[PDB]
């Protein structure tokens, strides 16, 4: 019972922290996204 419960709680804790890591990557994703869009628009005006 002790070993199975420790495995369960460790798996639950990993599932808890991975969402936080994913949210951090999402925030960095959005911050990169705005500058990516601006660079693309400037390339379009150069193209025109």
């Amino acid at each position: 019972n002790a070993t199975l419960f420790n495995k369960l709680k460790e798996l639950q804790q990993a599932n808890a922290e991975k969402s936080k890591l994913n949210d951090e990557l999402r925030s960095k994703y959005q911050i990169e996204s705005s500058k990516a869009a601006e660079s693309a628009q400037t390339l379009k005006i150069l193209q025109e």
Binding site: Y29, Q30, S33, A37
Partner: protein
């Protein structure tokens, strides 16, 4: 991407102001408008 001029040809002003306002909302405001509409979901990273 599509400019405003070509996208107002078939869509209205009010819908464009709605989607333009929903870019920089909160977390809970985006969740409330997600549950408001019929099987949709909004995002911070949704407008562009």
């Amino acid at each position: 991407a599509a400019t405003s001029e070509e996208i107002l040809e078939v869509h209205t002003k009010e819908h464009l102001e709605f989607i333009e306002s929903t870019e920089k909302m909160s977390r809970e405001e985006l969740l409330k408008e997600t549950e408001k509409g019929d099987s949709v979901y909004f995002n911070n990273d949704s407008y562009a």
